[PDB]
Structures are given as structure tokens and as C-alpha cells.
Curated annotation (Swiss-Prot), chain A:
Component of the ubiquinol-cytochrome c oxidoreductase, a multisubunit transmembrane complex that is part of the mitochondrial electron transport chain which drives oxidative phosphorylation. This is Cytochrome b-c1 complex subunit 1, mitochondrial. It comes from Saccharomyces cerevisiae (strain ATCC 204508 / S288c). PANTHER family: CYTOCHROME B-C1 COMPLEX SUBUNIT 1, MITOCHONDRIAL (PTHR11851:SF126), METALLOPROTEASE (PTHR11851). Its main location: mitochondrion. It is a peripheral membrane protein. Belongs to the peptidase M16 family. UQCRC1/QCR1 subfamily. Keywords: Electron transport, Membrane, Mitochondrion, Mitochondrion inner membrane, Respiratory chain, Transit peptide, Transport. One of its GO terms (cellular component) is mitochondrion. The lineage of its organism: Eukaryota, Fungi, Dikarya, Ascomycota, Saccharomycotina.
UniProtKB/Swiss-Prot annotation, chain B:
Belongs to the cytochrome b family. Component of the ubiquinol-cytochrome c oxidoreductase, a multisubunit transmembrane complex that is part of the mitochondrial electron transport chain which drives oxidative phosphorylation. Residues 1-27 are mitochondrial matrix. This is Cytochrome b. Component of the ubiquinol-cytochrome c oxidoreductase (cytochrome b-c1 complex, complex III, CIII), a multisubunit enzyme composed of 10 subunits. The complex is composed of 3 respiratory subunits cytochrome b (COB), cytochrome c1 (CYT1) and Rieske protein (RIP1), 2 core protein subunits COR1 and QCR2, and 5 low-molecular weight protein subunits QCR6, QCR7, QCR8, QCR9 and QCR10. It is found in: Mitochondrion inner membrane. Heme 1 (or BL or b562) is low-potential and absorbs at about 562 nm, and heme 2 (or BH or b566) is high-potential and absorbs at about 566 nm. The gene is COB. The chain crosses the membrane at residues 28-51. A ubiquinone binds at Y16. It comes from Saccharomyces cerevisiae (strain ATCC 204508 / S288c) (Baker's yeast). The chain holds residues 1 to 55 of 385 of the full protein. It comes from the Eukaryota.
UniProtKB/Swiss-Prot annotation, chains C, F:
One of its GO terms (cellular component) is respiratory chain complex III. Component of the ubiquinol-cytochrome c oxidoreductase, a multisubunit transmembrane complex that is part of the mitochondrial electron transport chain which drives oxidative phosphorylation. Keywords: Electron transport, Membrane, Mitochondrion, Mitochondrion inner membrane, Respiratory chain, Transport. Belongs to the UQCRB/QCR7 family. The gene is QCR7. Present with 10100 molecules/cell in log phase SD medium. It comes from Saccharomyces cerevisiae (strain ATCC 204508 / S288c) (Baker's yeast). This is Cytochrome b-c1 complex subunit 7, mitochondrial. It is a peripheral membrane protein. It is found in: Mitochondrion inner membrane. Pfam families: UCR_14kD. Its main location: mitochondrion.
From Swiss-Prot, chains D, E:
Its main location: mitochondrion. This is Cytochrome b-c1 complex subunit 2, mitochondrial. Component of the ubiquinol-cytochrome c oxidoreductase, a multisubunit transmembrane complex that is part of the mitochondrial electron transport chain which drives oxidative phosphorylation. The lineage of its organism: Eukaryota, Fungi, Dikarya, Ascomycota, Saccharomycotina. GO terms for cellular component: mitochondrial crista; mitochondrial inner membrane; mitochondrion; respiratory chain complex III. Belongs to the peptidase M16 family. UQCRC2/QCR2 subfamily. Present with 35700 molecules/cell in log phase SD medium. GO terms for molecular function: metal ion binding; metalloendopeptidase activity. The modification Phosphoserine is found at S125, S152. Coiled coil: none annotated. GO terms for biological process: aerobic respiration; cellular respiration; mitochondrial electron transport, ubiquinol to cytochrome c; proteolysis; proton transmembrane transport.
Length: 431, 55, 126, 352, 352, 126
């Protein structure tokens, strides 16, 4: 009714839904693709993909289980999904996979069939998924020589250099209990799981903490992947944003909300009450964009992302947009702010209140790791609404106005201008 | 588009002094035409101002 | 740029009041004669200045064969005007023809605009 | 004019207006597509700009969705505002302006783009090939528009008079309170909508078997089958597709796609093998058609299939739930075939 | 390496190099098209500019022609100059430069345009549909290129080594003196061409019957049939098509097109009913298929048919001349079907 | 615009004569060193001025990955040149590399042109 949180060594967390047809259990390791290193990159995405190799996934397929997995930057998750009654059928199959079995998934016929498929995997991504590719490199340059930089799915380089002796090197350090959280989502009780958990003995590497690295940092920089053979142009730009559990966590998400997200095709999109939109549409400066305030444990990235078949006029594209961003400091309409608060809520909803347990897991697992607990929607909303204009005019005033940016891109970006232009559009001339 | 590009007058200004695409590699030798236009302006200002007292 | 939406307001009012209508329309009729323009095959909606967005929302919208019509008149206009002449008396647009063929769209679009203007500056009371 | 709504203690309410006017009910080729893409346009008292403008301020969004069966006019909002989006959907159904210009500048355009992303995905290219050769003129209708048949604006309007009727819709609701829905549904223009009659097919559809058609395409190569399954054969091909798409069937890595559709009087079991190499289509279809005819005990995937259909369902309206436990073995009897991509180097049915 | 030449007292001599490498012999989809459109390009000792330049000065022109069977490298000139154009054609056959750039700037381009005028004529759209569903991989090959199969420049060169052989060509000639041809033919690079072997099919082709395929097209509507006739059935469908296209058959004004092709081991009898109205295709094909099955005494058009095949033939190489007089009645047994244009409003075979 | 076809004539001759070749090439070698250009990653065919049709027949023709190669060097050139520096000694193009990658096409095209020139003014004797 307010989400449960109790620890007997294994911090056991759950979240009940009485109208759910199914449920899900799993673990979340409080160390992700940003706890790795330059040459072991993709180790966390390698771990995910053995966990779903036909072997272990045929086991749980007779049982009636489905497994879910994802790696982030600050965190890393291993979830299993099934019918709510077969709730022990989950917990046991989890127990087998992470304390019982070890080299049953770590075969020299398994691992050389997973790594020979996480290699094709990260060779369609950087090959044909430019919007994320661009998005990923954006981190690489903004957070260069620092934790967040390492692409979550790992470089094809440090991904052909890795054997099983390396899957473990990360496992036995960062796959602990004092870095994990067990989650219960969907259609199960707190007294169903934490019972079935204290039912099982053993302890893996107790007392052990996972290790640390130099805290992340940010620096104004570019990286440009020109490719004049690609029909469009993809660009992503940002400033040093705000972390998870930062005073302006919501203030910053409200700002993103204002300019928001465009799709020049859906007539619905064309009518949004966004000021910037007035400009961009005249000549069709782009095909779409969208904003964001990506928050991570140590640092953040407020900016936006755009694709465009309009090559001669990208220079305006970036211009109109970064000028709008100036208003946030000097001239944002209050009535804009309300449409923000309003729309944030709708978005922040379909995020948190989707009828899909697997999401409510990672969400829970990550948050109850970093701050300890989760924060309720009513808590969030109570904050969103407190937000004045002055909220947004002092946040932009430090974060946005005349601060270093972080551009990245690919496709026909000859037209995308230089760094002393772009960066300079962070401000406006004053008397 | 931006105004400086759109205006009948400022578009020239932009396209010859602001948005002009120069080779990335050119050195201080190329600063001569610039400094050439500057003399011509020094010639014409000071000349006129002097002519006011010349016979 | 006195607005059509605004000419509607005024000219509808005058048309309605049997008082006003009897006073005004004789003159107005006398006016749209002295103009000379129906003698250059011109309907009045032809004359409306176009170099502005509303009319370009209003001509993009104007039915095809209707625009071909406009066109011929507009060229017929110029042609004759340059011949420093008036058309064959029986080529003139006749009083029943001079119909506001365009005016809906102009109005249609004006409306649409004033709406968006409003909806861009719509404020909030808490 | 059905009406449900499963409440809950949540922040985001939702909604819908599940109508029966997809491809199957399309008058001419893709007139649903022009009507799916005419929704949330201007009504005769409300402007689509104002409809969008106001919605954000209240914090909610609308979405007309198309498929073979539906034109689901769903909304999604914050809870306290349900009647707005309720009357909204209603107001769209009764009185959308259907102006000539709204077509040429917003409907036809938006329509053209959908088909654009279509012509660059061959799996879909063929999934319209299945239906149109198996079921034919019924559910074998072109899903999205393609100008081959000149659907005027009149033809878009008739289809609106047709499919927008009381006896032809089904209101849904999630995190909505059922009494609140029924009331506001009744006080809305919804109830004033000409009731007409249904078009829902209880009498099963005429089908075909062994039919084949091929397509000249520049892209990945894909081949596809089509099976006129029954109101009975429903749960069978459900435990089949979920086995073929799972780690049990050794040939899940020889089939790119496989799933069964569910109508209230039929379905369709299509398997797509797609790849760039025009080889891998000949190499993973000469085998797939075999291994199935040989015989597949679909039973070990009855613990799976249930889970993969109790998560799939989230629409308060579903088909035959309990039907699962009575499955066992499979054998591929007769079937239809569509080959897409490199035709001069892709299999024929006569060798399949 | 056959050689004929019918002299005459005329001013304009002609010529040819009738080769056996049309669609039917195409390695990949339309590699003849890339080779038909690579002829009279630069040789390794002669420039296509100089080839064109000099020719005009002598007063003569060249033309590479494609079809299902041939790649006829015909020339045409003033008489006194025969060896020039003779050695010319020869020089093209042996040593055309086949440079990378000549492709991208002259071959691929010129190829693209041919297909362009193709995609705006549905009768042809379907006449490739007939062949590719009836005969299949043999004569059912794509006539002109279409990028669906990436024919590299290597694949264009192999096909030149293949089809350009002594035992695979037939020199012709009109207003040429036969001895003059044979001599200059022998003194030309022609004789030095790797003889290889033939590809000409004496053994009749595997065919199909009752096969159907349909096409989504924006244009006029057209429906088309296909009949795997024999080396015997040749002169029959000849007196048929000439009757259907004449004032005798009452239904010549219900069929837009009808003719029989002639191979040295087969043919194909295609009838095209084409019109804008998707109706007139359903209205003039439900009847046409009937009136024939009913029975057609093709005999009154045996005085016609001869005339319409003694004027049609002007190539010194023809098929079975005397075969005409032994015809009588016709009856449509089995057949293949292609429908093009408005598919959701055009006939199916199951109703034909 | 001294012709490449013409540099071929002269430079082939000199290369052939074991007399000349021994005299010249030492210097020529000494020259293509003192130039400095292989120290800005430049192959000599990079340097050839392009603003003329022949070179634009000769770059349209130049194999893809070959042009991507040219490109990187040309940008590497400028970049470094503007840094007012020379490349890391081991990034320099090495003496075996400086190969006439372009020269065939230039020649290929020159040839083609001179031919057309001729064939435009080809006269006639009767
Ligand atoms: C002398 C110019 C005085 C003037 O009144 O010009 C007004 C001009 C209007 O702006 P404009 O871009 O023309 O607006 C669209 C209409 N075609 O505004 C301008 O042109 C301002 C340009 C400033 C001229 C600086 C050139 C040095
Ligand atoms: C290209 C531009 C010009 C050049 C190169 C030029 C050159 C010269 C030179 C060499 C002298 C003699 C200077 C001296 O030794 O005293 C001179 C004098 C003079 N110039 Fe110019 N001139 C230019 C433009 C002008 C203009 C626009 C005026 C406008 C009135 C002007 C007005 C005069 C006057 C009044 C004198 C006599 C006073 C003096 O010699 O300083 N000049 N000019
Ligand atoms: C392609 O590369 C370029 C490049 O294009 C440019 C433009 C520059 C920059 C160079 C320039 C901007 C040079 C431009 C030169 C001029 C504009 C010279 C033109 C000067 C005139 C035409 C003089 C006219 C002057 C007047 C009318 C002033 C007279 C008025 C008077 C005297 C009023 C005073 C009188 C009273 C009574 C008060 C570069 O550096 C450059 O290198 C990378």
C-alpha cells in the first residue's frame, strides 16, 4: 500500500498490484556499465546475454518462466517474470542461477556463442541505430575519461578481448549482496517473497563490498562522426545536468518538459504549445526532436536530441533551440511552466504507472538502492507543483546560461556549425 | 531561418563577414585585404575632413 | 490590414438594420460601379491584396477550377489594362457575379489565426 | 455500446472507444487509414489546435490507433478529468469537421508517411499478402491507404457514418470508475450517435488454402505462410507461436517472426523468415516447413504460453481465456505462401 | 556462327548479330539488360564517341536490341561500307572495355530509364508476370534490370564471356551480298571469338498451368492470361490471336491486347484486357474466358493469319512457316492468370 | 595547365634513358623531400589542383574508399598546417606510399578530351 522494505541480510523489497494478472521477481546490482573500466567494457551486457542464452531460457520455459534483463549506467538488473502463484518457481530459478550454478552457463560452447552474438549485437547498433549511437557518444565526450563515458553495451573492441575469466572478474567483485536488491512487482505480497527468501540458507562472499573509482566529471567538448552517405543528420547536445537526488531533479525535468519532443509528421505534434515550434516549422528545419534531463548518481545531462533531412539549414535548427533555452533564464512565461507541470505529470505517470511489472522492478531496484527507498507519485507531484517560475529562472541561470555544452552527431553534419558558435548561443547580448 | 540570413541587407553582411566558409588553414598573410579595406576607409574619412579646409 | 472578420462585423450589422441598409447600400451599390473594375472582368475578390499569409492560406484552399477562373480574369485584367481599354461591354462581370467566392476562406483563416494568437498567450489563474 | 472500467488507486487514468472498422470493414482500400488519420482533427465546435492546446494544460493526450479490426480512439490523462476526454472522444465520433483542406494538408499527408515506413519493412509487406490471398476481400483488405483506389473525401465520410454507431463500438477504461464512465458516456454525444447495427462477424469467414503470391522488393528477403485457423484452433497456435519464439523449439533461431492473430471469428498464423541473404530464406524455410509436418508436441510450452498471454492482455476486452490446457501435438496440414525480396532466388510453394 | 544475306538493288544496306542471351539465358535478374545497354560502348581499341562520330560521316547507325531470346546487335548503313559495321559489331563482341565508370555513368543510368518507362505500362508489368509464374526460372526471367538482385560489373562481364560465342550467334543480312558477309565475317574478330557451345533449347521447357499472381499498381487496370503452347500448337494460336485482333471476332473490342510469342521450343499466348475503369476488366474478362471455352472455329481467319505473318516476318530468320492450313476449332483448356491495377476490384481466377 | 599527358611524354623518356635516369632521378628524389609535403600526410596526387573539368572527371571516377582516403589526408593536412606544425614523424607518408593513385584517371580523362577536341574539328578531304 506504500511499498515494503525489509532486510535480513538480503534487502527484500516489493510493490503490490491487486489488479495485475502476473508478477515478477529479480535482483538489481547497484553497479552498472559505469563501474567497469576502459578495456573490460560491455562485460555487463555480456553477463546479460548469457543469462538469456537458449540454455538457461529453455530451462525456465518448461517451468513457465520468462526472464528480463537490462544494464544501465549506475545500475544493473536481473529479473524473472511468471504467473503470481508460481512465485517460488521464480525464487528457486533465481537461486540456481546466481549461487548454485556457475560454470553451467559459463561453458566454452555457451560463452563462445553468446560473445559471438553480443558482437553482432553491437555491430548493428553503431551501424544502423544512429539516434542512440549519437546519444551514446554524447556521454563519451561530455563525460570523457570518467565512469559514465563507457557505452552500456560496450565497445566492439573491449568486447572481443573478453573471455570468461573476465565475466567473473566483474561478477565476484560487484555481484554481491551489499550491492543488490531483490524486487517483487505485480501480483504478489511482501509476506509471500520475504518468507520464501528466509526459507533458503547459504551466503555468498559475506562482508564483501564492491569497489570504487574516481567520481565522474563533465567538460565541454565535441565528437563528430560525419557520414555524407546517410540520408539524414543526427545531433544530440547538452550541459552538465542534475543527478538523481539533486535539489533540482524535478525543476530540471520540468524545463525539459517545456520544449519537449517533436515529430513533424504526426499533425498532433505540429500543434503543441511549444514556443520553439513556431520557428522550426517554417521551412521544416527538422524531422523530429526531443529533450531530456538524464540523471545519474554523480552527474547529469540536460539537453536535447534531433534528426533532420534538412542539411543546409541545420545551423538555424541548433540556433532557434539554444536561444529558446535562454528564455528559461530571462523570460519564461509562467503559463508555459503550468503546461509543463501538467505534461510532466502525464509523462512521469506512464513511466511509473505502466501495467508491466518488469519496469516497476528496475525502477524500484535502482531507486531503493541509491536513496534507500522509492518515492511515491504523490510525493513527486507535491514537488513538481511547488515549482515557481523563479524555480526555472535560477536553475537555467546556473545550469544553462553561458555554460559548456557537449555535442555529438553523424550523417550529413557538415552544416552543423562549430563549437565557438554553438557554445556562444548559450547567452544573449545585454546592456 | 534567422533574420540576418533573411533580411535583404543583413544577408549580405552575414554572407561575407559572418557565415562565410573559410579554409581552416589560412594564416596571417590573408589578413591583408581586410587591412586593405581599413586603409581605404582611413583614406576616405581623413581626406574629406581635410578637404573642408583645403583650397 | 483592416480585418475581414472586422469588415464582417460592421457590414453585417448595416445589412441587418433595415434602417441603415436602406441608407447605405444605395451608395455602396453606386460605389462598386464607379470603381470601374467589373469592366476589366474583375470580380471584387480578385482585387484583394495577396502578399500576406492569410490570403496564401486562402488560395491554397480555394477549389482548383475556381483558381483557374481567378487566373484568367487576373490575366484578362492586366492584358486589357495594358491595352489602355475596357472590355467588350458584354464581357464585363455582371452584378450577380461579383460574389464573395474567396471571403469564406479569408474568414475561415482569419478565424483560425486569431484563435492561435489567443492560444499562444492564454494565461492562467490559480 | 458496451462500457467497462477497471478502477485502481493510480495517478494516470486512461480510456478508449474501441470501434469495429479496421481493414476488414473498409469500404475501399484503406478508408479506415484515412479515417484513423482524421480523428482528433477539427470537430464542428472544437479546433484540433484547441483540442491539443487545452489537453496539455489539463495534462492528457489522445491517439487514434488502427488495425485489421479496430479504430481504437484511446485517450490518456490525469484521473480527475475523465469527462473531458470522455466527451472529447464522443465529440470526435459525432461531428469531426471533415473539411476539404484538412484532408489535403493533414490527412492525405499523414497517410502517405505511414505507408512510407511500410514500404521499408517487408515482413509487413507480406503480412498484407497473407490476408489478401487467404481470406480475400474480407480480412484480406489493404490495411493502410495506397492511392491505387481513389478514396475521395466523400468515401471517407460515408465510412464515418458507417462505423461510428452505438451497436458498433465498445467503450473501455482502466483506472476509471465504471459508474462515472456509464454516466458521462450517456450524457455525452456518444448516446446521441445514430445506433445503426453491428458489423461484427459471428459467422466464420470464407478462407483459402494453398494460395501463393510473390513480390519484387528491394530490401531484406522474407518468406511468409498463412493459416485460416478456427475459433477452436485458437489456443493451439498460441502455444505453437510461443514455442517457436522460445528457447524450447530448436528452430527459434531459424524463424525471424511467428505469431497468431485473434478475431472473434477467426485468426491467422503467419511465420516470417526474413534476412538480407536470399539464401538464408531458402535454407531456413526448406527446414521449417519440414520439422512441423514431422510433428511438434506443443505441450511443454503450456506453462509458457499462458504467461505470454496473461501479460499480452491488458485491454479489458480479450478472446477465449480458458482453452489452454487441452493442447498436445502439432502437424502442419495445408497452408498459403508469400515470398518477398529476391524472387528468382527464393523458394516456391511447389517445393514447400 | 550461321551467316545469311538477302541481296537487293537498294541504297541502304543493313546487318545484325542475332545472339542467344535474352532474359531466358540471364544469369541474374536482367544481366542481359546491363549488357544490351553496354554494347557500342568503348571497345579496347575504339572509343564509343569515335564509333558514333565516324559512323555518321560514313552515314550509318548501330542499335543493341533486347528481348526474351535475343540481344540483336543490328547495324544499318549505306551499302558500300559493309565491312566497317561488320568489323564494328565483331569488335564490340570481343573487346568492349567494360570499364567501372562506363557502368555508373552510362550503363546503370541508361538501364534505370528503360525500367522507368516500364513501370508506367501495366500490360508489360504483367507480361513479366505471365512468364515468371508459368515458365519460371527459365523464360520466366525478369526482362529488364531492377536492382532487386545486385548485378555487379563482374556479373555483367561473365555474361559477356558466356553469350558471346561462335556456337551461340547468328549473323543476318539484308541488301548484303552473302559472299561478302562470310568473308568479312571470317576476316573479322568474330571468328576469333571463343567458340564455346550453344544454349539454344531444343528440349521443350517445363511449364505450369493454373498459376496466378496479382499486382498493386497505380495506373490503368489490366488482367492477363498465359498459355504454355507447344512446338505444335504454334500455328493454332497464331490464327487465334489474329482473329481476336480482327473484325471477325466480335470480341476484338473487349480485348486490348492478344498475341503469341514464338521460340524454337515454345511460345506464350497472352491476352491483355486493359482499361482505367477497374470495372471494364471484370466486364470484359468474365466474357472473354467464356466465349473461347464455348468454342471458336478459328478457320475463317486462315486467309488473314498468313498475311499477318508474311508481313510480320522480315528477319531472314523465322519459325515454322508452313503449318497454317491444318487448323480448325479452338477450346480454352487450362490457363494462368495475372491481374494488375485495382486488385480489390478485379476478377480472381477462381471465378474465371 | 602543363598537361599530364605531356608530363608523361617527358618523364617517361627520362625514366627510360639509363643515361638520363641516373642524372635526373637523384635530384627529383632530393626534390620530393625538400617539398615538405609527405610530412603533412600528403601524397603527391593530393596536391594536384582540382578546379578544372578533367580532375572532376577524375575524382568522380576515383574508387570510393580511395576518396575517403584522400579526404582524411587533405583534412589532416589543413588541420596540421593550421597548428603550424608537422606530423608525428611516423605518421608521414613513406616513400613507397607516394604512388600516382590518381594519374591514370587524369591521363584516362585527358586522353578522352584531346580525342573529342580532335573529333570536333576533324576536317575532310574529298
Ligand atoms: C534602411 C532600412 C530601413 C528600413 O525601414 O528597413 C526595414 C527592414 C525590414 O525588415 P524586412 O527583412 O524587410 O522584413 C520583411 C519584409 N520584406 O529592416 C532592415 O532591413 C534592417 C537592416 C539593417 C541594415 C543594415 C545594413 C548595413
Ligand atoms: C585611396 C584613397 C587615397 C589615397 C591613396 C590618397 C593619397 C594622397 C596623398 C599621397 C596625398 C599627399 C599627402 C601629403 O604628402 O601631404 C593626399 C593629399 C590629400 N588628399 Fe588624399 N588620398 C586618398 C583619398 C582621399 C579622399 C577620399 C579625400 C577627400 C577629400 C582626400 C583628400 C586629400 C586632400 C584635401 C589632400 C591635401 C592635404 C594633404 O596633402 O594631406 N584624399 N592624398
Ligand atoms: C574570403 O575571405 C575573407 C573575406 O571575405 C573577408 C570579407 C574578410 C574580411 C575583409 C573585409 C571585411 C574587407 C572589406 C573591405 C571593405 C568593405 C572596403 C570597402 C570600403 C569602402 C567601400 C569605403 C566607403 C566609405 C565611406 C562611404 C565612408 C565615408 C563617410 C564619411 C567620410 C562620413 C564622414 C563625413 C562627415 C561630414 C561626418 C577576410 O578576412 C577574409 O579572410 C579570411
Amino acid at each position: 500500500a506504500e511499498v515494503t522494505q525489509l532486510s535480513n541480510g538480503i534487502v527484500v523489497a516489493t510493490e503490490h498490484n491487486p489488479s495485475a494478472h502476473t508478477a515478477s521477481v529479480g535482483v538489481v546490482f547497484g553497479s552498472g556499465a559505469a563501474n567497469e573500466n576502459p578495456y573490460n567494457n560491455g562485460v555487463s551486457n555480456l553477463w546479460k546475454n548469457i543469462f538469456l542464452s537458449k540454455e538457461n531460457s529453455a530451462v525456465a520455459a518448461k517451468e513457465g518462466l520468462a526472464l528480463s534483463s537490462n544494464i544501465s549506467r549506475d545500475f544493473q538488473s536481473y529479473i524473472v517474470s511468471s504467473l503470481p502463484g508460481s512465485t517460488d518457481k521464480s525464487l528457486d530459478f533465481l537461486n540456481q542461477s546466481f549461487i548454485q550454478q556457475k560454470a553451467n552457463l559459463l561453458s566454452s560452447s555457451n560463452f563462445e556463442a553468446t560473445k559471438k552474438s553480443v558482437l553482432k549485437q553491437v555491430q548493428d547498433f553503431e551501424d544502423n541505430d544512429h539516434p542512440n549511437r549519437v546519444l551514446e557518444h554524447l556521454h563519451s565526450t561530455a563525460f570523457q575519461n570518467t565512469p559514465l563515458s563507457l557505452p552500456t553495451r560496450g565497445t566492439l573492441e573491449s568486447l572481443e578481448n573478453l573471455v570468461v575469466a573476465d565475466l567473473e572478474s566483474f561478477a565476484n567483485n560487484h555481484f554481491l549482496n551489499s550491492n543488490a536488491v531483490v524486487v517483487g512487482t505485480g501480483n504478489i505480497k511482501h509476506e509471500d517473497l520475504v518468507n520464501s527468501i528466509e526459507s533458503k540458507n547459504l551466503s555468498l562472499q559475506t562482508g564483501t563490498k564492491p569497489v570504487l573509482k574516481k567520481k565522474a566529471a563533465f567538460l565541454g567538448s565535441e565528437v563528430r562522426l560525419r557520414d555524407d552517405t546517410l540520408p539524414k543528420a543526427w545531433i544530440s547536445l547538452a550541459v552538465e545536468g542534475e543527478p538523481v537526488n539533486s535539489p533540482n531533479y524535478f525543476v530540471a525535468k520540468l524545463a525539459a518538459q517545456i520544449f519537449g519532443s517533436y515529430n513533424a509528421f504526426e499533425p498532433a505534434s505540429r500543434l503543441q504549445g511549444i514556443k520553439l515550434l513556431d520557428n522550426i516549422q517554417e521551412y521544416q528545419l527538422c524531422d523530429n526532436f526531443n529533450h531530456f534531463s538524464l540523471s545519474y548518481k554523480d552527474s547529469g545531462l540536460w539537453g536535447f536530441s534531433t534528426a533532420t533531412r534538412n542539411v543546409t539549414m541545420i545551423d538555424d535548427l541548433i540556433h532557434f533551440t539554444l536561444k529558446q533555452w535562454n528564455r528559461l533564464t530571462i523570460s519564461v512565461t509562467d503559463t508555459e511552466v503550468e503546461r509543463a507541470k501538467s505534461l510532466l505529470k502525464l509523462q512521469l505517470g506512464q513511466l511509473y504507472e505502466s501495467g508491466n511489472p518488469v519496469n516497476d522492478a528496475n525502477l524500484l531496484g535502482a531507486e531503493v538502492l541509491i536513496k534507500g527507498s522509492k518515492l511515491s507519485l504523490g510525493e513527486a507531484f507535491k514537488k513538481i507543483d511547488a515549482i515557481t517560475v523563479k524555480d526555472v529562472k535560477a536553475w537555467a541561470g546556473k545550469r544553462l546560461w553561458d555554460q559548456d555544452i557537449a555535442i555529438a552527431g553523424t550523417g550529413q553534419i557538415e552544416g552543423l556549425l562549430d563549437y565557438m558558435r554553438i557554445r556562444s548561443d548559450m547567452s544573449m547580448m545585454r546592456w | 531561418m534567422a533574420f540576418r540570413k533573411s533580411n535583404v541587407y543583413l544577408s549580405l553582411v552575414n554572407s561575407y563577414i559572418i557565415d562565410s566558409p573559410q579554409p581552416s588553414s589560412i594564416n596571417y598573410w590573408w589578413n591583408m585585404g581586410s587591412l586593405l579595406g581599413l586603409c581605404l576607409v582611413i583614406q576616405i574619412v581623413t581626406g574629406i575632413f581635410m578637404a573642408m579646409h583645403y583650397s | 490590414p483592416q480585418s475581414f472578420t472586422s469588415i464582417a462585423r460592421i457590414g453585417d450589422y448595416i445589412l441587418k438594420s433595415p434602417v441603415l441598409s436602406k441608407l447605405c447600400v444605395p451608395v455602396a451599390n453606386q460605389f462598386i460601379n464607379l470603381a470601374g473594375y467589373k469592366k476589366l472582368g474583375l470580380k471584387f475578390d480578385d482585387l484583394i491584396a495577396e502578399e500576406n499569409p492569410i490570403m496564401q492560406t486562402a488560395l491554397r484552399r480555394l477549389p482548383e477550377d475556381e483558381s483557374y477562373a481567378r487566373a484568367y480574369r487576373i490575366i484578362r485584367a492586366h492584358q486589357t489594362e495594358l491595352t489602355h481599354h475596357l472590355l467588350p461591354r458584354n464581357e464585363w462581370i455582371k452584378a450577380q457575379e461579383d460574389v464573395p467566392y474567396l471571403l469564406p476562406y479569408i474568414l475561415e483563416a482569419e478565424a483560425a489565426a486569431k484563435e492561435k494568437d489567443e492560444l499562444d498567450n492564454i494565461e492562467v489563474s490559480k | 455500446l458496451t462500457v467497462s472500467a477497471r478502477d485502481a488507486p493510480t495517478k494516470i487514468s486512461t480510456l478508449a472507444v474501441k470501434v469495429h472498422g479496421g481493414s476488414r470493414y473498409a469500404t475501399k482500400d484503406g478508408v479506415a487509414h484515412l479515417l484513423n488519420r482524421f480523428n482528433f482533427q477539427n470537430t464542428n465546435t472544437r479546433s484540433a489546435l484547441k483540442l491539443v492546446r487545452e489537453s496539455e494544460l489539463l495534462g492528457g493526450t489522445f491517439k487514434s490507433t488502427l488495425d485489421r479490426e479496430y479504430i481504437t480512439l484511446k485517450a490518456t490523462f490525469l484521473k480527475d478529468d475523465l469527462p473531458y476526454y470522455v466527451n472529447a472522444l464522443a465529440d470526435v465520433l459525432y461531428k469531426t469537421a471533415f473539411k476539404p483542406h484538412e484532408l489535403t494538408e493533414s490527412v492525405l499527408p499523414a497517410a502517405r508517411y505511414d505507408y512510407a515506413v511500410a514500404e521499408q519493412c517487408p515482413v509487413k509487406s507480406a503480412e498484407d499478402q497473407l490476408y489478401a490471398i487467404t481470406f480475400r476481400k474480407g480480412l484480406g483488405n489493404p490495411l493502410l491507404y495506397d492511392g491505387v483506389e481513389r478514396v475521395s473525401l466523400q468515401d471517407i465520410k460515408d465510412f464515418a457514418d458507417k462505423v461510428y454507431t452505438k451497436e458498433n463500438l465498445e467503450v473501455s477504461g482502466e483506472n476509471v470508475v465504471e459508474a462515472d464512465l456509464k454516466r458521462f458516456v450517456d450524457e455525452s454525444l456518444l448516446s446521441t450517435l445514430p445506433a445503426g447495427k453491428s458489423l461484427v462477424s459471428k459467422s466464420e469467414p470464407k478462407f483459402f488454402l494453398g494460395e501463393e503470391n510473390r513480390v519484387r522488393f528491394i530490401g531484406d528477403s522474407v518468406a511468409a505462410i498463412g493459416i485460416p485457423v478456427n475459433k477452436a484452433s485458437l489456443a493451439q497456435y498460441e502455444v505453437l507461436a510461443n514455442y517457436l519464439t522460445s528457447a524450447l523449439s530448436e528452430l527459434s533461431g531459424l524463424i525471424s517472426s511467428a505469431k497468431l492473430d485473434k478475431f472473434t471469428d477467426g485468426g491467422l498464423f503467419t511465420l516470417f523468415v526474413r534476412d538480407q541473404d536470399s539464401a538464408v530464406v531458402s535454407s531456413n524455410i526448406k527446414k521449417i516447413v519440414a520439422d512441423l509436418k514431422k510433428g511438434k508436441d506443443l505441450s511443454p510450452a503450456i506453462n509458457y504460453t499462458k504467461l505470454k498471454n496473461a501479460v499480452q492482455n491488458e485491454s479489458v476486452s480479450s478472446p477465449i481465456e480458458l482453452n489452454f490446457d487441452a493442447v498436445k501435438d502439432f502437424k502442419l496440414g495445408k497452408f498459403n505462401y508469400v515470398a518477398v525480396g529476391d524472387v528468382s532466388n527464393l523458394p516456391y510453394l511447389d517445393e514447400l
